[PDB]
Design an enzyme around this catalytic site. Structure first.
Site, PDB file in Angstrom:
ATOM      1  CE  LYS A   1     -87.220 -62.274 105.218  1.00 42.82           C
ATOM      2  NZ  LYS A   1     -86.227 -61.530 104.725  1.00 42.82           N
ATOM      3  CG  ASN A   2     -86.233 -60.017 101.412  1.00 44.68           C
ATOM      4  OD1 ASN A   2     -86.535 -59.274 102.364  1.00 44.68           O
ATOM      5  ND2 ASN A   2     -85.549 -60.262 101.078  1.00 44.68           N
ATOM      6  CD  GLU A   3     -88.212 -53.131  98.082  1.00 43.82           C
ATOM      7  OE1 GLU A   3     -87.614 -52.340  96.838  1.00 43.82           O
ATOM      8  OE2 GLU A   3     -88.686 -52.123  98.711  1.00 43.82           O
ATOM      9  CB  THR A   4     -86.987 -58.503  94.442  1.00 41.55           C
ATOM     10  OG1 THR A   4     -85.919 -58.673  94.942  1.00 41.55           O
ATOM     11  CG2 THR A   4     -86.497 -56.660  94.166  1.00 41.55           C
TER      12      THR A   4
ATOM     13  CB  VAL B   1     -67.363 -71.556  98.987  1.00 37.91           C
ATOM     14  CG1 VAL B   1     -67.393 -71.038  97.503  1.00 37.91           C
ATOM     15  CG2 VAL B   1     -66.071 -72.768  98.700  1.00 37.91           C
ATOM     16  CB  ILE B   2     -68.799 -66.497 100.220  1.00 34.13           C
ATOM     17  CG1 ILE B   2     -70.200 -67.526 100.002  1.00 34.13           C
ATOM     18  CG2 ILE B   2     -68.742 -65.167 100.484  1.00 34.13           C
ATOM     19  CD1 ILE B   2     -71.102 -67.633 100.821  1.00 34.13           C
TER      20      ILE B   2
ATOM     21  CD  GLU C   1     -67.483 -68.011  94.556  1.00 32.13           C
ATOM     22  OE1 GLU C   1     -68.421 -67.006  95.604  1.00 32.13           O
ATOM     23  OE2 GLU C   1     -67.410 -68.652  94.120  1.00 32.13           O
TER      24      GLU C   1
ATOM     25  CB  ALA D   1     -78.848 -72.002  94.888  1.00 34.33           C
TER      26      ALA D   1
ATOM     27  CG  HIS E   1     -58.987 -84.125  70.612  1.00 31.91           C
ATOM     28  ND1 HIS E   1     -58.025 -84.314  71.077  1.00 31.91           N
ATOM     29  CD2 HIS E   1     -58.322 -83.465  69.255  1.00 31.91           C
ATOM     30  CE1 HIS E   1     -57.200 -83.174  71.021  1.00 31.91           C
ATOM     31  NE2 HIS E   1     -56.988 -83.683  70.125  1.00 31.91           N
TER      32      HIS E   1
HETATM   33  C1  FAD Z   1     -58.329 -76.738  60.011  1.00 35.07           C
HETATM   34  C2  FAD Z   1     -58.891 -77.850  60.350  1.00 35.07           C
HETATM   35  C3  FAD Z   1     -59.934 -78.142  61.702  1.00 35.07           C
HETATM   36  C4  FAD Z   1     -59.600 -79.495  61.885  1.00 35.07           C
HETATM   37  N1  FAD Z   1     -60.780 -79.032  63.460  1.00 35.07           N
HETATM   38  C5  FAD Z   1     -61.123 -79.818  64.066  1.00 35.07           C
HETATM   39  C6  FAD Z   1     -61.816 -80.058  65.834  1.00 35.07           C
HETATM   40  O1  FAD Z   1     -61.482 -79.094  65.843  1.00 35.07           O
HETATM   41  N2  FAD Z   1     -61.979 -81.355  66.500  1.00 35.07           N
HETATM   42  C7  FAD Z   1     -61.643 -83.021  65.240  1.00 35.07           C
HETATM   43  O2  FAD Z   1     -62.551 -83.358  66.117  1.00 35.07           O
HETATM   44  N3  FAD Z   1     -60.828 -82.656  64.005  1.00 35.07           N
HETATM   45  C8  FAD Z   1     -60.686 -81.689  63.288  1.00 35.07           C
HETATM   46  N4  FAD Z   1     -59.929 -81.472  62.002  1.00 35.07           N
HETATM   47  C9  FAD Z   1     -60.398 -83.439  61.717  1.00 35.07           C
HETATM   48  C10 FAD Z   1     -58.576 -84.257  62.321  1.00 35.07           C
HETATM   49  O3  FAD Z   1     -57.925 -83.039  61.869  1.00 35.07           O
HETATM   50  C11 FAD Z   1     -58.812 -85.900  61.965  1.00 35.07           C
HETATM   51  O4  FAD Z   1     -60.267 -86.159  61.942  1.00 35.07           O
HETATM   52  C12 FAD Z   1     -57.921 -86.088  62.048  1.00 35.07           C
HETATM   53  O5  FAD Z   1     -56.930 -85.383  62.420  1.00 35.07           O
HETATM   54  C13 FAD Z   1     -57.326 -87.240  61.530  1.00 35.07           C
HETATM   55  O6  FAD Z   1     -56.530 -88.267  62.226  1.00 35.07           O
HETATM   56  P1  FAD Z   1     -55.609 -89.503  61.830  1.00 35.07           P
HETATM   57  O7  FAD Z   1     -54.876 -90.227  62.753  1.00 35.07           O
HETATM   58  O8  FAD Z   1     -56.895 -90.873  60.931  1.00 35.07           O
HETATM   59  O9  FAD Z   1     -54.925 -88.881  60.096  1.00 35.07           O
HETATM   60  P2  FAD Z   1     -54.346 -87.825  60.090  1.00 35.07           P
HETATM   61  O10 FAD Z   1     -53.915 -86.513  61.426  1.00 35.07           O
HETATM   62  O11 FAD Z   1     -54.536 -86.945  58.660  1.00 35.07           O
HETATM   63  O12 FAD Z   1     -52.507 -87.983  60.549  1.00 35.07           O
HETATM   64  C14 FAD Z   1     -52.084 -88.564  58.829  1.00 35.07           C
HETATM   65  C15 FAD Z   1     -50.440 -88.800  59.341  1.00 35.07           C
HETATM   66  O13 FAD Z   1     -50.067 -89.871  58.510  1.00 35.07           O
HETATM   67  C16 FAD Z   1     -48.683 -89.513  58.111  1.00 35.07           C
HETATM   68  N5  FAD Z   1     -48.812 -89.996  56.408  1.00 35.07           N
HETATM   69  C17 FAD Z   1     -49.522 -90.627  55.457  1.00 35.07           C
HETATM   70  N6  FAD Z   1     -49.541 -91.372  54.638  1.00 35.07           N
HETATM   71  C18 FAD Z   1     -47.794 -91.545  55.219  1.00 35.07           C
HETATM   72  C19 FAD Z   1     -47.040 -92.661  54.504  1.00 35.07           C
HETATM   73  N7  FAD Z   1     -47.055 -93.690  53.751  1.00 35.07           N
HETATM   74  N8  FAD Z   1     -46.025 -92.856  56.111  1.00 35.07           N
HETATM   75  C20 FAD Z   1     -45.429 -92.492  56.910  1.00 35.07           C
HETATM   76  N9  FAD Z   1     -46.055 -91.243  57.520  1.00 35.07           N
HETATM   77  C21 FAD Z   1     -47.535 -90.658  56.764  1.00 35.07           C
HETATM   78  C22 FAD Z   1     -49.270 -87.428  57.413  1.00 35.07           C
HETATM   79  O14 FAD Z   1     -47.945 -87.287  57.105  1.00 35.07           O
HETATM   80  C23 FAD Z   1     -49.752 -87.371  58.877  1.00 35.07           C
HETATM   81  O15 FAD Z   1     -49.135 -87.301  60.034  1.00 35.07           O
HETATM   82  C24 FAD Z   1     -59.825 -80.646  61.197  1.00 35.07           C
HETATM   83  C25 FAD Z   1     -58.977 -80.447  59.928  1.00 35.07           C
HETATM   84  C26 FAD Z   1     -59.207 -79.482  59.682  1.00 35.07           C
HETATM   85  C27 FAD Z   1     -58.016 -79.191  58.008  1.00 35.07           C
HETATM   86  C1  FAD Z   2     -71.753 -64.613  98.615  1.00 29.90           C
HETATM   87  C2  FAD Z   2     -72.835 -65.554  98.324  1.00 29.90           C
HETATM   88  C3  FAD Z   2     -73.214 -65.846  96.741  1.00 29.90           C
HETATM   89  C4  FAD Z   2     -73.121 -67.444  97.109  1.00 29.90           C
HETATM   90  N1  FAD Z   2     -72.905 -68.190  95.816  1.00 29.90           N
HETATM   91  C5  FAD Z   2     -73.671 -69.408  95.501  1.00 29.90           C
HETATM   92  C6  FAD Z   2     -72.752 -70.782  94.470  1.00 29.90           C
HETATM   93  O1  FAD Z   2     -72.298 -69.928  93.912  1.00 29.90           O
HETATM   94  N2  FAD Z   2     -73.700 -71.463  94.303  1.00 29.90           N
HETATM   95  C7  FAD Z   2     -74.483 -71.914  94.943  1.00 29.90           C
HETATM   96  O2  FAD Z   2     -75.091 -72.952  94.520  1.00 29.90           O
HETATM   97  N3  FAD Z   2     -75.092 -71.018  96.093  1.00 29.90           N
HETATM   98  C8  FAD Z   2     -74.453 -69.951  96.390  1.00 29.90           C
HETATM   99  N4  FAD Z   2     -74.957 -69.501  97.643  1.00 29.90           N
HETATM  100  C9  FAD Z   2     -75.753 -70.048  98.420  1.00 29.90           C
HETATM  101  C10 FAD Z   2     -77.360 -70.156  98.058  1.00 29.90           C
HETATM  102  O3  FAD Z   2     -77.410 -68.750  97.911  1.00 29.90           O
HETATM  103  C11 FAD Z   2     -78.078 -70.278  98.781  1.00 29.90           C
HETATM  104  O4  FAD Z   2     -77.389 -71.679  99.633  1.00 29.90           O
HETATM  105  C12 FAD Z   2     -79.286 -71.070  98.463  1.00 29.90           C
HETATM  106  O5  FAD Z   2     -80.071 -69.299  98.147  1.00 29.90           O
HETATM  107  C13 FAD Z   2     -80.590 -70.771  99.065  1.00 29.90           C
HETATM  108  O6  FAD Z   2     -81.567 -71.235  98.729  1.00 29.90           O
HETATM  109  P1  FAD Z   2     -82.884 -70.926 100.051  1.00 29.90           P
HETATM  110  O7  FAD Z   2     -84.435 -70.423  99.208  1.00 29.90           O
HETATM  111  O8  FAD Z   2     -82.412 -72.403 100.667  1.00 29.90           O
HETATM  112  O9  FAD Z   2     -82.829 -69.571 100.795  1.00 29.90           O
HETATM  113  P2  FAD Z   2     -82.729 -68.529 100.286  1.00 29.90           P
HETATM  114  O10 FAD Z   2     -82.002 -67.600  98.423  1.00 29.90           O
HETATM  115  O11 FAD Z   2     -81.496 -67.571 102.153  1.00 29.90           O
HETATM  116  O12 FAD Z   2     -84.291 -67.403 100.119  1.00 29.90           O
HETATM  117  C14 FAD Z   2     -84.490 -67.127 101.112  1.00 29.90           C
HETATM  118  C15 FAD Z   2     -85.941 -66.051 100.795  1.00 29.90           C
HETATM  119  O13 FAD Z   2     -87.333 -66.072 102.185  1.00 29.90           O
HETATM  120  C16 FAD Z   2     -87.435 -65.351 102.240  1.00 29.90           C
HETATM  121  N5  FAD Z   2     -87.750 -64.960 104.028  1.00 29.90           N
HETATM  122  C17 FAD Z   2     -87.399 -65.253 105.008  1.00 29.90           C
HETATM  123  N6  FAD Z   2     -88.449 -65.921 106.144  1.00 29.90           N
HETATM  124  C18 FAD Z   2     -89.479 -65.671 105.498  1.00 29.90           C
HETATM  125  C19 FAD Z   2     -91.008 -65.108 105.331  1.00 29.90           C
HETATM  126  N7  FAD Z   2     -91.024 -66.078 106.937  1.00 29.90           N
HETATM  127  N8  FAD Z   2     -91.663 -64.687 105.005  1.00 29.90           N
HETATM  128  C20 FAD Z   2     -91.634 -64.236 104.107  1.00 29.90           C
HETATM  129  N9  FAD Z   2     -90.254 -64.000 103.652  1.00 29.90           N
HETATM  130  C21 FAD Z   2     -89.128 -65.327 104.213  1.00 29.90           C
HETATM  131  C22 FAD Z   2     -86.210 -64.307 102.332  1.00 29.90           C
HETATM  132  O14 FAD Z   2     -85.825 -63.169 102.173  1.00 29.90           O
HETATM  133  C23 FAD Z   2     -85.470 -64.959 101.038  1.00 29.90           C
HETATM  134  O15 FAD Z   2     -85.980 -64.209  99.926  1.00 29.90           O
HETATM  135  C24 FAD Z   2     -73.597 -68.293  98.029  1.00 29.90           C
HETATM  136  C25 FAD Z   2     -75.007 -67.242  99.147  1.00 29.90           C
HETATM  137  C26 FAD Z   2     -73.748 -66.055  98.819  1.00 29.90           C
HETATM  138  C27 FAD Z   2     -74.126 -65.241 100.125  1.00 29.90           C
END
Ligand code: FAD
Ligand code: FAD
Lengths: 482, 477
Positions: free
Chosen positions: B40-43, B191-192, B195, B331, B455
């Site tokens: 029934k509505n426009e969109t 919730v509404i 928000e 929804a 991680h």
């Molecule tokens: C820039 C960068 C970004 C990265 N980003 C990610 C990411 O986003 N996600 C992800 O999963 N991985 C990431 N990595 C990889 C992750 O850092 C390594 O896989 C991880 O740290 C390995 O853990 P580990 O415990 O095997 O070794 P390590 O973290 O290398 O720890 C080894 C420790 O043993 C010590 N050590 C060594 N020899 C001896 C000894 N003989 N006696 C005492 N202490 C000793 C060292 O000093 C060190 O503290 C990244 C690495 C780099 C360099």
């Molecule tokens: C402010 C606000 C925020 C929200 N945030 C969330 C959220 O974040 N996540 C979430 O899951 N839910 C959220 N909701 C809830 C969600 O909007 C409703 O749960 C969902 O839209 C229900 O869907 P529906 O298809 O049942 O009904 P509706 O979306 O209400 O659609 C019903 C439709 O039927 C049309 N209609 C009714 N009678 C007739 C007829 N006889 N002939 C023709 N057309 C008809 C209406 O014009 C409308 O277009 C929120 C609602 C509000 C108001």
């Protein structure tokens, strides 16, 4: 403290488990071992706990990516399109770097607290394995402390892989460690390697105003195992943001110059096409490799594989059965969560439990904007293994949350087994990829079908609906909203 | 097209184009039903697209960015801005662009799927017929095998207060205010209300929500979660009067409103003056002029249409889904009911577990939850365990410096089955979908904690709260 044995504490100690290294692998293994009842020691050489990830890795890099992304949103079009109007946006790089160090500092200190709360004995020293049941820690004052132990857990981590003939000084030729601490945005930066780490740090500096080119020997961005289509679309997005790439290119050398700049010599990887590109900072990130220096392996006769890794079995035992190894020192993806999971299960096995891990269920994430994330197999891996599969795709441009936020690059791609409908891989390029992959990891753990996923009620409006709908399209042939 | 009226013949005729109806129509067409959708509505898109989820998320997103810029957050990350201005028209225009894009998207998806769109007010005029009456009085008759009622909801009025969408607004007017009110009172802290109140408070309004019950966030929110949530919002400047009823509101000659309130038990009368009064005490099912009384389909005492487990009304070829029927008024719930209703019309199984339907509040921090609250498990006498993990010990959250809240997991004592998941904090909205997957699976806390999460992710909080419920302690806290 009995719980901290630093310089001057040199009495012999005994333990059930002695963990060498405090990175994700080791610190989590130590905590878990203590929680299981083991008398536990963790030995760390550096001044802080947490390893590569905390100190110079995951943490400071994600902090800078989070902050540079906000900078880019503020500085560019994004904020003005939302009615948020600013006269001047300025970079204060000291302050952004301070937000980074604060986080590291808090998390490194958190580990120390966790060790204390769980009665882990922290030995500050360099651990060398001096017999089948003994580790000797050498301290910063020259002192030594002997640990008599039933089990040993090697978690010594990784280091930056050096590039022959280019000397990293952490000044203008930096590793990831120096890239994380530049004191000014460089006008031009070259990155050697377009792997995860290079792309991330490149993107950080590019957003802050550097002109950035990454040079890579291989044909694709984002490292090993990334799906090619994902990589290619990711590349294209990064290029439109102003990140430049030379793929299939090797670096033949580099030279520091009298003007302070650096001429990087490059050519085609096949041979031919010599050029020089000039930059202010040269970031060298061609790889990371296992770190086992001075640990005593040769003498115990534990031989390394050819890449430097410690060979282990499925319970993480080395060939000496009470000596275990995990994390970046062993085979598999060099990732924090992989090191932690190995730590946990290793120590669970030592206490009596089961030990299986499948590296296929290990996700990867690139924390750019858009993010990239995946788990399970790529299309290239499926073709290589002869597995027959179906593809479902759903673009973020048709997802309601992404549209409402006006953040719509990318897609979800799901790969399903053609006959069973089993989810074989999930690949996500776009907003929220890194969180969303964890839903996919849960599904793969249980062996879900694309249908099972598509039938789960996802909240509307959420980026996750793209995940749901790409599964519906893999399963049924079509999604609802695209 | 346009060269003695002709009826349309259909297998499925959907009345309403909101989340339930539009989705049901697309799916029906994809299953091979000849399908018609009447609106029934426009969109297209119903309450959600046009005056609901969509515009409200757009304003939440933009007002949040405004609060980061205008506040101390961006300064702290070394993003220094000399002066930060609100341009409300431009923020509203971003909202309208999103709405327009998405409502046009649905029209395009009906074309792509060969859903016939009829624009009119639909009345069921026979067991097999719907008549649509256009705004000019023109009629289109559809003779149809099945009829799907997806007529949605409307704003519940407050007795004795008349909404005029000017100074006394429903959610619809709240979403289009032309200027930030100096002072706003919200009736309802569901919730509404939370928000839209938070939107305007971030934009500079002095906002107070008044609520009859003792908690924020509406029905079924876990109490611990709700208290913690309200504390955080109070620290942002949002004021609450709980256990308080509104007795009436007066539109004053000077353009303001005088709202009278007192304790919900009785007593403590006071009057608070505001510029805009947002009335959001609820929503109710909409069935006006649909022809139900004439077919003999009686409503339940709340105005909903009673349906079976396949969504059949008492007339078995007439169905009803979404906000016009029982269960949470969300929804994604309407969407799922529409898909499964139409799968069931093709002969398949129809299953929805409402306990598995998540809820989200899109404030900052977000709240989200799925499955049962502690209160519900206590009422049902279920023995359970608790795991909690605060975002302040989560690596990603700490790295982002966005560390309010927690994950709380409720586990079954006897089997370790997950019973509920409750998230307050960053990423709660997206995180709850992993949690919904777990509740749908009946997954155990031990198994969720074993799964390899990336991680550093906020999702590790979820993983570790499961660990804590299963083994008794988490690693990082
Ligand atoms: C820039 C960068 C970004 C990265 N980003 C990610 C990411 O986003 N996600 C992800 O999963 N991985 C990431 N990595 C990889 C992750 O850092 C390594 O896989 C991880 O740290 C390995 O853990 P580990 O415990 O095997 O070794 P390590 O973290 O290398 O720890 C080894 C420790 O043993 C010590 N050590 C060594 N020899 C001896 C000894 N003989 N006696 C005492 N202490 C000793 C060292 O000093 C060190 O503290 C990244 C690495 C780099 C360099
Ligand atoms: C402010 C606000 C925020 C929200 N945030 C969330 C959220 O974040 N996540 C979430 O899951 N839910 C959220 N909701 C809830 C969600 O909007 C409703 O749960 C969902 O839209 C229900 O869907 P529906 O298809 O049942 O009904 P509706 O979306 O209400 O659609 C019903 C439709 O039927 C049309 N209609 C009714 N009678 C007739 C007829 N006889 N002939 C023709 N057309 C008809 C209406 O014009 C409308 O277009 C929120 C609602 C509000 C108001």
């Amino acid at each position: 403290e009995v719980l901290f044995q630093g310089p001057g504490a040199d009495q012999p100690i005994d333990a059930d488990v002695t963990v060498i290294g405090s990175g994700p692998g080791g610190y989590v293994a130590a905590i878990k071992a203590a929680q299981l009842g083991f008398k536990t020691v963790c030995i760390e050489k550096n001044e802080t706990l947490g390893g590569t990830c905390l100190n110079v890795g995951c943490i400071p890099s994600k902090a800078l990516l989070n902050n540079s992304h906000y900078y880019h949103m503020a500085h560019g079009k994004d904020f003005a399109s939302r009615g948020i109007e600013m006269s001047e946006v300025r970079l204060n790089l000291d302050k952004m770097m301070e937000q980074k160090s604060t986080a590291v500092k808090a998390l490194t200190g958190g580990i120390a607290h966790l060790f204390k709360q769980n009665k882990v004995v922290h030995v500050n020293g360099y651990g060398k394995i001096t017999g089948k049941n003994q580790v000797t820690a050498t301290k910063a004052d020259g002192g030594t402390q002997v640990i008599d132990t039933k089990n040993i857990l090697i978690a010594t981590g990784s280091e930056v892989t050096p590039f022959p003939g280019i000397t990293i000084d952490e000044d203008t030729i930096v590793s990831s460690t120096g890239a994380l601490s530049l004191k000014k945005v460089p006008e031009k930066m070259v990155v050697i390697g377009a792997g995860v780490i290079g792309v991330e740090l490149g993107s950080v500096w590019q957003r802050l105003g550097a002109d950035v080119t990454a040079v890579e020997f291989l044909g694709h961005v984002g490292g090993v195992g990334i799906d090619m289509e994902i990589s290619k679309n990711f590349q294209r997005i990064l290029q439109k943001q102003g990140f430049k790439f030379k793929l299939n290119t090797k670096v033949t050398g580099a030279t520091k110059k009298s003007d302070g700049k650096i001429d990087v010599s490059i050519e085609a990887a096949s041979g031919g096409k010599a050029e020089v590109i000039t930059c202010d900072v040269l970031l060298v990130c061609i790889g990371r490799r296992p770190f086992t220096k001075n640990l005593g392996l040769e003498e115990l006769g534990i031989e390394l594989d050819p890449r430097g890794r410690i060979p282990v079995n499925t319970r993480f035992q080395t060939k000496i059965p009470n000596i275990y190894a995990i994390g970046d020192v062993v085979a598999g993806p060099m990732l924090a969560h992989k090191a932690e999971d190995e730590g946990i299960i290793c120590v669970e096995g030592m206490a009596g439990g089961a030990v299986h891990i499948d590296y296929n269920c290990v996700p990867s994430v690139i924390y750019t904007h858009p993010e990239v994330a995946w788990v399970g197999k790529s299309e290239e891996q499926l073709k290589e293994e002869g597995i027959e599969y179906k593809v479902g795709k759903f673009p973020f441009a048709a997802n309601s949350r992404a549209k409402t936020n006006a953040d719509t690059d990318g897609m979800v791609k799901i790969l399903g087994q053609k006959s069973t409908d089993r989810v074989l891989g999930a690949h996500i390029l776009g907003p929220g990829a890194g969180e969303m992959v964890n839903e996919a990891a849960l599904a793969l753990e249980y062996g879900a079908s694309c249908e099972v996923i598509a039938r789960v009620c996802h909240a509307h409006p959420t980026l996750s609906e793209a995940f749901r709908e790409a599964n519906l399209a893999a399963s049924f042939g079509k999604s609802i909203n695209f």
